[PDB]
Amino acid sequence: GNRLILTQELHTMLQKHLFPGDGKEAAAILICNRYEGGRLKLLAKELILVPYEECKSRTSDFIAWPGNYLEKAIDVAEEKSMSIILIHSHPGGFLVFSDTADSSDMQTMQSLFQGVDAIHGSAIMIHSGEMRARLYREGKFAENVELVTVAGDDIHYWWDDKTLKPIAFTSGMTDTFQKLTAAIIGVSGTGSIVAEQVARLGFGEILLIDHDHIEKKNLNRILNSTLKDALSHRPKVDMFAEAIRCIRGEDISRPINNTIFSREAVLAAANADVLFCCVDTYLARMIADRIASSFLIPLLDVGVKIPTHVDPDDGRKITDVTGRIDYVKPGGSTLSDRLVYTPELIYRENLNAEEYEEQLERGFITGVEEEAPSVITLNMRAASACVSEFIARCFPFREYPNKRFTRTFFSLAGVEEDYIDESSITQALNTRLAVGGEEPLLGLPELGDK
Amino acid sequence: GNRLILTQELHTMLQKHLFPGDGKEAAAILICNRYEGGRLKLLAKELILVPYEECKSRTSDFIAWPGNYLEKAIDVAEEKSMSIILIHSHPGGFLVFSDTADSSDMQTMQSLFQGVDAIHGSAIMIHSGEMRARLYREGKFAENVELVTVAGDDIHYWWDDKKPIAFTSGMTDTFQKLTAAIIGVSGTGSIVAEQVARLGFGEILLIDHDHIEKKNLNRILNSTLKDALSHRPKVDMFAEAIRCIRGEDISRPINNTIFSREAVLAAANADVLFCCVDTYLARMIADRIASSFLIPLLDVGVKIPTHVDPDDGRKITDVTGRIDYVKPGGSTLSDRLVYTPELIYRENLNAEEYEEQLERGFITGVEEEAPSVITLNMRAASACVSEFIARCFPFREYPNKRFTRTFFSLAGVEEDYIDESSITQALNTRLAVGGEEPLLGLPELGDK
Amino acid sequence: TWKLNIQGKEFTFDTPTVVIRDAVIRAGLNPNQAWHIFLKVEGQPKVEKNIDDVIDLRTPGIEKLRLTPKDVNNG
Amino acid sequence: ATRRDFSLRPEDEHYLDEMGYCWETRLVGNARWLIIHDYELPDGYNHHQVNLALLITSGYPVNMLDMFYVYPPLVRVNGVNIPATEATVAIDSVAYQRWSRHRSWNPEIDSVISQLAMADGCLQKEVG
Amino acid sequence: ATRRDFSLRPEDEHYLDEMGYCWETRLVGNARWLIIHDYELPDGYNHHQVNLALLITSGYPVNMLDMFYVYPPLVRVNGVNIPATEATVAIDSVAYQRWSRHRSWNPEIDSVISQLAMADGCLQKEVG
């Protein structure tokens, strides 16, 4: 099932342009990249607004605008064969005119194909923001876009089969999730709990990405794991995919036995509607961050920690028992912006054995991990808040705007929970945004082809 | 593996008596009921303090005290054949004197047995409150008490074989010696039971009468579609899951209501009760088991109330959870109004009685809610089990007593705590009565 | 002397004000790690602080200085 | 008298015996009925003796007792109906009149004993 | 020159080619080494040409590059050692001298290009 995905920033700007308040139609042009994996994803990259003053007519059910903007679109799209989607206010009637000639809706779509050998489309927005889109192959009407979506502070799904919105926890929530793909990156302490919830909430397809295996030491944490799994060092994703098959009675999960830092895993995850990042390295969190930005996928990143310290009188004790949940929307602040990873953290984490021995010998590191062992109670407390966060954003039920909860930190030792609003986070330049699978994949030469 | 269980109230009084501050031994006598199920549990019921003034030879390492206190304990204990435990400040040396005879520790234990045909014992407390005890059978030294315990605001375990920080191997070693009971093994209870199993509890009782259906596959951990299509009992399913996870048969499934002699007598063996039910009646049974057999109790509930808005239609009113910790002799679920007679009454009308009496207007209608959901169940169940860890292995920056009740709202984004000292306590008639008949004071549980 | 609760435990200092960094060091915590630093005073919302800020232990209602890790990375 | 399918509280049974009642405990399905045979009434009703029954609710005495039941149904001797007594409930096929009489319930002090005291108070009251 | 076990960023390779370097990318186990052959040095060292190598870290260019490596090891022509250059690291058995030279890393702008600029700056600096 294909997708047209807009960022919240582009959608807001589009809706102000198409509904200035005068009740007259307006026109704009969306230039998109594409991901052609298990589903066609159209990734909104650039927007061209047709100024009202350069339109020959603007009425309540029609508009005539100049074809020179069509040619500006083609020009932007030409190099990378980008897809071009014309958008118009709710009725949708329009024509394009040149200095000497008029072209209908269909003539315009054919000229788009003539200028760019690629899929193109035509979309309509209603005053409240919802969108519908039709695709054209070879300049000729083809299929409707099944899902137009914006993952903002709230997550909006505008389905081609729409005929009220459901409320959280009801059959209508399940009906929505049944049509979505979820990717769980890291299927261990938190990730097995996230994947369990996702499966039992009725998600239609579930990607499982992890390179590690069940051992005796993680039977205290990984849901559905057994002593028999541990004795055979069963891969985490294969164990969990077979448990989902038994739970759901259906083969709806795709186990990827590999690191997320692989072409196999990145290209599988790019098909998802939502990423749940439950990893335990800074490096993996950067890969997830760049997938989310490149392919316009909302991202929920969850981390836990039980730091300890040495009290000078009493010895070692627990410093905090803590969890962190980060919601990252396409075009909003990223995990990088929030310093969830940095170059220094990634560099320090990935030293080889002779480097570790040298660091110890020179006194740069102590060789003490100032944390207590992970525990299922904290993992579950974090993973349940993580999946509830997606529910809250798809089906708002809170008494405050979801934007207030872009970051959550909770302390079970200090018995406190704090929230950080998206507006307080500084955003850097986001060079991955909506580039999809441009090579090198995610901008990482280790992921380039061949 | 046996137990001597004191309430926090008796332990506090005992420690003050035995350690007044002059560094000299003192003596006291604890009279106990017993539960003789899978393990012997001695249930501290009454305490006699021997006044310092009536003693002689009170020093840092010895005390001689009068035998009329021994006769008082025998007289209290005679009717129900209660166990009598002598307690002394740490070194523990003593004799018991009368006009005609002085009696050593061994001779005193023989006199107890002559006065009351029961197991008796002798215990020592050190200044910081930890206790060790030895049991005497037919008046002669027998075996040590494997575990002396007080479930207070903090939960204390004084093992004969003898502090670790939470989440380390020391925590797991403790849990391996404990028995947990999960009452209700469904939405929250399957999650509590999962955590208890993976945290390493050595024995896990599972109590529920219900079976798996397609409708609860969105919530019950380890459940499968085949389970639902074959109406497999919740407890049998979960017991088999524990067996494969833990590699050993450590689960005890009880396919029955908690309101049965079978379930009450099994749960009485537990070191901790987790109550995860959807009825007022079962919460009341759990409350009374906990008091009668001196077992700490964690009770958890969640609710998603809904209402009909005029412009939007049905919407979510709130999304809430509750965790209650009940220590033996502290405020109870009944004190906290978690159930009341009126709520039990209305719940246990049959369909036609309920409809008929709703019309009459003496009862009120039950409120509307959305379907249960695994995320909320897990949010409550994780905090429920973490509460037990925090009481056994303190890690919070405040006294555990501040968190005696916890309420959270995921809609209002608030979490509130209620201190034990703010809860009014009614008379607790079940406290440490063990299996006195009718069981729990409920005639339906009586032995005919 | 003046007292300050750090991470749940009371410590005594011999000066009326202290640099947060020094209070963190005294409790055995590592001041060079990434922290959410909060000072709580009775009757007031908690206030986020910087590692090299000065706090006045005479402030009426002074409750506790508290750190929460910013690098929370396990799964 | 001799029918005793279940037990009440020990104090209940002592009270019923000390009162010299002919009393039975009868299970009807899962319902637990206390039935006092030939309970004597004040003058003023169509009958001078009834069976007086209590439904012993599940969870008693933490669950409350509520209302009471009489057979044959009572009417004032002048033919005026007793207020709030129009329902009937079958006990082993015999239709008892149910008296809608309600009160607060405290498990520390309430029992069959106080519920029978309430019943008698209502029976004394409703002669007029 | 001809050895190319892995790719750098397209802009890296363009820069190395536009500079006319003889450059190789060599996998040694899982380690990714960029090696520039016969890199010309200013006067003032025991050698006038070296191999100049960068360790291309995992996750580059989000992971940082750090330090640089030269073979044969360099000493000032008067025999004085270059500060903070005493470690060696074997690359396919050849012992390279590691220069402890560190800087902040910004993934939006840093690459092999800026890391080679740093290396040259250090090599210019340490003639004296």
Ligand SMILES: Nc1ncnc2c1ncn2[C@@H]1O[C@H](COP(=O)(O)O)[C@@H](O)[C@H]1O
């Ligand atoms: N009297 C009882 N004895 C045992 N289990 C009970 C009792 N009352 C309720 N429960 C169980 O509590 C569980 C609540 O389910 P849920 O609301 O999904 O957590 C159900 O499986 C019930 O059968």
Ligand code: NA
């Ligand atoms: Na941005």
Ligand code: NA
């Ligand atoms: Na009490």
